[PDB]
């Protein structure tokens, strides 16, 4: 087939990783330039894998790396492959967005999967630790297994961590063979997601075989699968806008049986299960001693599906189908008339969860969603390259004025294009309220300098997105924000603009990465941990002040946004060793929004990872946090001074009369102050250490408190999972839900809290 004319195939290639010392390293690889024919009859396996591996990238024997990104582009066509496509560390596999190409498995295909994102060597060891397998894309493909035997075949071995996405993929599999069909679209053994959007699964034994700590996956369609979704294990998983059609089972979450359930929790929102034998198979019963198998249904239709929820241990129909299920919860609930202050295990349908109309799509009544923009219809001439217009991107030159002038000059029908590189910013960049910005394979934008961002007593925004009260369209995609050296006064992004319509103001595949990699000066040599000594809290190891601030009047749509403070060093020489980086605050949301956050994560800040202050109209699904591993050496009262202009938590005061004072002074997972109409559909809020020691895991007591609701907040929490916090949820200083009352298979889990 002809070239599509998609801008990405043609835009001038001027990108280069600033901290790769090879001046000839090529970020962009078109597989046909490596000899792929794309006719569906020539074997293209070698050419595709060569396009990925070229340039001494992070493969076997490489723990991780950030200086060898690649964007591997597949023009329209059909690519016959007979061995796995091995996606090296930090690879974007980008099929043509206008006419997604087919990856066609040969009849005699051999290997784990058509795409393997984490191979196993002959010793059974992964190339990369699954929890460290960050910063990936696979987008715009048809994966066709129908020439393979019905007894074998997997589309993608998707064993990955955060800042990863599958987007716009069709999986075509065989429908014959009965119980002997074993094809599956995704095979996932473990990991720590992550986002998936806009997937279609046709046929196979399993649309997806899933196992992961946590994931957010929305707009998935399953047609004619035996089981659409086999949930092998998890701690939490949020599905939204799932369409299951003519399957035997929709979601199987009964693995392990009633005395060994390995699925922690599942949430299913805004979905439809059609012409399916059993909608959801579960082993949960409210008389069980634990919370494993927690399930939330919210706005799920069950057309032509006679059994909506079945207990497959007893064979008993829990919920009848052929109706709309407004709300269903099984697991433990707190608050309101049902659970109260002590909590109660339930398995019941109940009243609809009414959500503010400003959060909803008016055409569907579902919570509003929008996938990462690829600008299919924008001609290449509308793209304004920052490097063509005076920015150097070399990680040393001050690019502030050039970037500001570009932002001031572009008109709304253009798109600012960040060529790959590292762009040093030394004072506030004012982003206008009508702009579109997209990056070449996660370019770095780094707050640098030696004064402007140095003062935690006088913090300053790095990117100031709109001025207060402005409204328009601001879209950013495929970027990383960080610091060049310590910048403890940097507010990485201050979000003032509001979208003219839902989704018109937002971030997609935009991450904040504080420390840990080449260019930050915050790596193993500077910031290695030392748990045996009282932490000196080196000034050279500070991060930023606050990674994201949605101010009053601001409104944003966030999807696949990882707000990460480095727990360990990422270049291969560091061998994943752990470091101390002191970053004050994660995500702070204020005002009436709305704010949507799909597949966001915020990890390892000192004071809090998410905080809402005087906020309304917040929808997050699902969220994930971690406490920094060095606490409590130092504890959360250091090294950031309490600043009431940000409603900072004051642990010295809040922990004074704590009955668990030894670990009270620890970062909040979620803190809500005077905030209402906040909805959280799925949360994994984890505390894994005390001064790098994990003894506290044995007694689920690495910290005292994890979620705080304060000042008459009204927050709706669904599928709240926490790890090793004595109190899961505290209201006005009073512990409400305790870990010991809600034990799951690893975390503790509350199905439903409403205030
Ligand atoms: C869910 O994702 C699918 C897969 O990307 C979307 O279907 C595509 O929609 C575009 C635009 O309408 C078409 O050009 C493609 O041909 C579609 N592909 C397939 C395989 O159907 C779908 O629009 C998404 N649904 C929602 C509600 O966002
Ligand atoms: C919830 O998960 C826990 C953890 O896996 C289950 O407890 C384990 O059950 C297996 C049997 O399948 C035992 O071999 C382990 O020793 C148990 N571990 C612990 C720490 O108790 C528990 O049975 C599950 N609960 C439900 C109701 O399914
Ligand atoms: O292995 C280290 C990784 O462990 C995971 O649990 C965390 O989510 C990551 O932030 C971290 O870098
Ligand atoms: Na860890």
| Residue 183 tokens, joined | 């094809």
Show the DSSP H helices in 5-53 as ranges.
7-10, 45-53
Nearest to 589 by CA among 646, 504, 655: 646
Nearest to 65 by CA among 86, 90, 87: 90
Omega before 471 cis (within 30°)?
A: no
Other C-beta atoms closer than 10 Å to the C-beta of 301 total 18
| H or E stretch covering 252 | strand 249-252
| H or E stretch covering 527 | helix 524-527
Interatomic CA distance for residues 496 and 517, integer angstroms = 29
Distance 687 CA to ligand 4 centre (A): 10
Distance 445 CA to ligand 3 centre (A): 22
Other C-beta atoms closer than 10 Å to the C-beta of 288 total 17
| Residue 272 tokens, joined | 């439809």
Pocket test for ligand 2, best of 745, 746, 749 (most atoms within 8 A of CB): 745
* CA 292 to ligand 2: nearest atom: 1
| Residue 502 tokens, joined | 């839902």
SS3 state at 652: helix
Mention every residue, 6+ apart, whose C-beta is less than 8 A from residue 342.
none
Interatomic CA distance for residues 189 and 750, integer angstroms = 25
- The upper half-sphere exposure of residue 483, i.e. CA atoms within 13 Å in the direction of its Cβ, equals 36
Q: Is the CB of 257 under 6 A from ligand 2?
A: no
Distance 237 CA to ligand 2 centre (A): 20
Interatomic CA distance for residues 563 and 480, integer angstroms = 10
Nearest to 139 by CA among 112, 162, 169, 114: 169
Looking at ligand 3, which residue's alpha carbon is closest to its atom 6? 131
- Residue 614 — φ and ψ, nearest 5°? 50, 40
E strand residue ranges, 577-675: 585-591, 595-603, 608-626, 668-673
Omega before 632 cis (within 30°)?
A: yes
Q: Is the CB of 658 under 6 A from ligand 2?
A: no
**CA dihedral of residues 597, 598, 604, 605 (deg, nearest 10):** -10
Nearest to 292 by CA among 754, 623, 746, 753: 746
- 352: buried, middle or exposed (CB in 10 Å: 19+, 13-18, 0-12)? exposed
SS3 state at 20: coil
| Residue 210 tokens, joined | 């899933």
In the chain the domains, ranked by start, together with CATH numbers, are 2-349 (2.160.20.10), 381-755 (2.160.20.10)
* CA 688 to ligand 3: nearest atom: 6
Question: DSSP 3-state helix, strand, coil percentages of the chain (rounded to 5)?
Answer: 10, 45, 45
Mention every residue, 6+ apart, whose C-beta is less than 8 A from residue 455.
488, 489
Q: How many residues does the chain have?
A: 755
Cα distances from 287 to residues 290, 296, 332, 606, 753, in angstroms, run 9, 18, 11, 39, 19
Annotate 51-76 with DSSP letters as a single string: HHHTTT-S-TT----SS--EEEEE-S
What 3 state SS string does 104-169 have? Answer: EECCCCCCCCCEECCCECCCCCECCCHHHCCCEEEEEEEEECCCCCCCCCEEEECCCCCCEEEEEE
Distance 720 CA to ligand 3 centre (A): 20
Please, are residues 624 and 214 in contact by the beta-carbon 8 Å criterion? yes
Task: Looking at the CA of 131, name the nearest ligand.
Answer: 3
Please list, residue by residue across 359-383, b when 16 or more beta carbons sit within 10 angstroms of its beta carbon and e when fewer do.
bbeeeeebbbbbbbbbbeebeeebb
Strands 725-731 and 415-418: unpaired
**What radius of gyration do the chain's Cα atoms show?**
25
Interatomic CA distance for residues 96 and 74, integer angstroms = 6
Please, are residues 249 and 204 in contact by the beta-carbon 8 Å criterion? no
SS3 state at 645: helix
| Residue 535 tokens, joined | 């932490």
Interatomic CA distance for residues 189 and 211, integer angstroms = 5
Looking at ligand 2, which residue's alpha carbon is closest to its atom 5? 745
Interatomic CA distance for residues 418 and 481, integer angstroms = 12
> What letter would DSSP give residue 403?
H
* CA 744 to ligand 2: nearest atom: 1
Looking at ligand 2, which residue's alpha carbon is closest to its atom 10? 260
Report residues whose beta carbon is within 6 angstroms of any ligand 3 atom. Answer: 131-132, 192, 564, 567-568, 603, 626
Please, are residues 78 and 62 in contact by the beta-carbon 8 Å criterion? no
- Residue 645 — φ and ψ, nearest 5°? -65, -15
> What letter would DSSP give residue 400?
H
* CA 369 to ligand 1: nearest atom: 28
Sign of CA dihedral 573, 579, 583, 585: positive
Cα distances from 447 to residues 18, 328, 508, 552, 589, in angstroms, run 15, 46, 20, 24, 21
Interatomic CA distance for residues 726 and 741, integer angstroms = 10
Please, are residues 389 and 402 in contact by the beta-carbon 8 Å criterion? yes
Nearest to 14 by CA among 507, 414, 390, 375: 390
Interatomic CA distance for residues 401 and 369, integer angstroms = 35
Task: Looking at the CA of 130, name the nearest ligand.
Answer: 3
For residue 289, the Cα-to-chain-centroid distance in whole angstroms is 31
The experimental technique behind this entry is X-ray
Nearest to 595 by CA among 604, 587, 583, 603: 587
Looking at ligand 1, which residue's alpha carbon is closest to its atom 17? 168
> What letter would DSSP give residue 490?
E
What 3 state SS string does 697-718 have? Answer: HHCCCCEEEEEEEECCCEEEEE
Cα distances from 495 to residues 469, 477, 524, 591, in angstroms, run 11, 15, 32, 11
End-to-end CA distance of the chain: 57
């Amino acid at each position: 087939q002809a070239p599509s004319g998609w801008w990405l195939a043609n835009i001038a290639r001027q990108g280069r990783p600033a901290f790769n010392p090879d001046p000839n390293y090529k970020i962009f690889r078109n597989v046909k330039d490596y000899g792929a024919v794309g006719d569906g009859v020539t074997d293209d396996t070698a050419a595709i894998n060569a396009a990925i591996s070229d340039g001494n990238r992070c493969g076997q024997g490489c723990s991780s790396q950030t200086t060898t990104p690649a964007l591997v582009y597949f023009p329209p066509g059909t690519y016959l492959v007979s061995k796995p496509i091995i996606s090296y560390y930090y690879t974007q596999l980008v099929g043509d967005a206008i006419s997604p190409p087919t990856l066609k498995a040969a009849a005699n295909f051999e290997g784990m999967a058509v795409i393997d994102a984490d191979p196993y060597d002959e010793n059974g060891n992964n190339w990369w630790t699954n929890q460290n397998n960050f910063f990936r894309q696979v987008r715009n493909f048809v994966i066709d297994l129908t020439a393979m035997p019905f007894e074998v075949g997997s589309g993608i071995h998707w064993q990955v961590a955060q800042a990863t996405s599958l987007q716009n993929i069709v999986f075509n599999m065989r429908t014959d063979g009965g119980d002997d069909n074993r094809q599956q679209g995704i095979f996932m053994d473990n990991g720590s997601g992550g986002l998936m959007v806009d997937l279609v699964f046709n046929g196979g034994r399993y649309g997806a075989f899933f196992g992961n700590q946590q994931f957010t996956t929305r707009n998935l369609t399953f047609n004619n699968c035996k089981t659409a979704i086999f949930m092998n294990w998890n701690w939490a998983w949020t599905f939204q806008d799932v369409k299951i059609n003519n399957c035997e089972v929709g979601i199987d979450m009964s693995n392990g049986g009633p005395d060994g359930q390995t699925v922690g929790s599942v949430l299913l929102l805004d979905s439809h299960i059609t012409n399916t034998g059993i909608g959801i198979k579960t082993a949960y019963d409210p008389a069980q001693p634990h919370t494993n198998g927690t399930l939330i249904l919210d706005n799920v239709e069950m057309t032509g599906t006679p059994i909506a929820v079945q207990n497959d241990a007893t064979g008993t129909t829990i919920v009848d189908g052929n109706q709309k299920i407004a709300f269903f919860a099984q697991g433990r609930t707190y608050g309101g008339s049902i659970g109260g202050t002590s909590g109660k295990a339930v398995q019941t349908t109940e009243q609809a969860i009414v959500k503010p109309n400003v959060l909803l799509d008016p055409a569907t009544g579902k919570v509003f969603t929008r996938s990462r923009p690829q600008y299919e219809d924008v001609p290449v001439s509308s793209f304004v390259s920052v490097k063509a217009n005076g920015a150097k991107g070399d990680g040393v030159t001050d690019d502030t004025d050039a970037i500001q002038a570009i932002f001031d000059s572009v008109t709304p029908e253009q798109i600012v294009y960040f060529d790959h590189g590292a762009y040093i910013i030394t004072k506030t960049v004012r982003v206008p309220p009508n702009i579109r910005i997209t990056g070449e394979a996660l370019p770095l934008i780094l707050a640098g300098g030696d004064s402007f961002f140095k003062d935690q007593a006088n913090p300053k925004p790095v990117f100031q997105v709109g001025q207060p009260g402005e409204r328009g369209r601001v879209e950013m995609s495929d970027l990383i924000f960080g610091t060049a050296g310590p910048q403890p006064g940097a507010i990485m992004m201050e979000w003032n603009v509001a979208g003219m319509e839902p989704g018109a103001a937002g971030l997609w595949d935009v991450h904040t990465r504080i420390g840990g990699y080449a260019g930050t000066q915050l790596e193993l040599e500077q910031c290695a941990k030392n748990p045996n000594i009282t932490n000196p809290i080196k000034p050279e190891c500070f991060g930023s002040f606050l990674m994201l601030h949605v101010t009053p009047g601001g409104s944003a749509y966030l999807e696949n946004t990882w707000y990460w403070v480095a727990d360990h060093a990422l270049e291969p020489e560091a061998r994943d060793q752990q470091i101390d980086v002191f970053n004050g605050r994660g995500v702070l949301i204020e005002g009436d929004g709305p704010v949507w956050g799909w597949g966001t994560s915020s990890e390892h800040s000192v004071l809090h990872n998410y905080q809402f202050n005087n906020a309304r109209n917040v929808f997050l699904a699902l969220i994930q946090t971690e406490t920094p591993y060095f606490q409590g050496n130092p504890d959360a009262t250091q090294p950031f001074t309490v600043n009431p202009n940000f409603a900072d938590p004051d642990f010295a005061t809040s922990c004074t009369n704590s009955p668990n004072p030894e670990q009270c002074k620890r970062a909040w997972g979620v803190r809500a102050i005077n905030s209402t109409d906040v909805f959280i559909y799925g949360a994994g809020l984890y505390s894994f250490f005390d001064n790098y020691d994990q003894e506290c895991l044995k007694t689920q007591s690495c910290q005292t408190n994890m979620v705080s609701l304060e000042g008459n907040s009204q927050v709706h929490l669904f599928g709240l999972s926490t790890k090793a916090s004595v109190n899961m949820l505290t209201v006005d200083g009073n512990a409400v839900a305790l870990d010991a009352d809600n034990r799951n298979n690893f975390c503790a889990t509350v199905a439903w809290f409403q205030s």
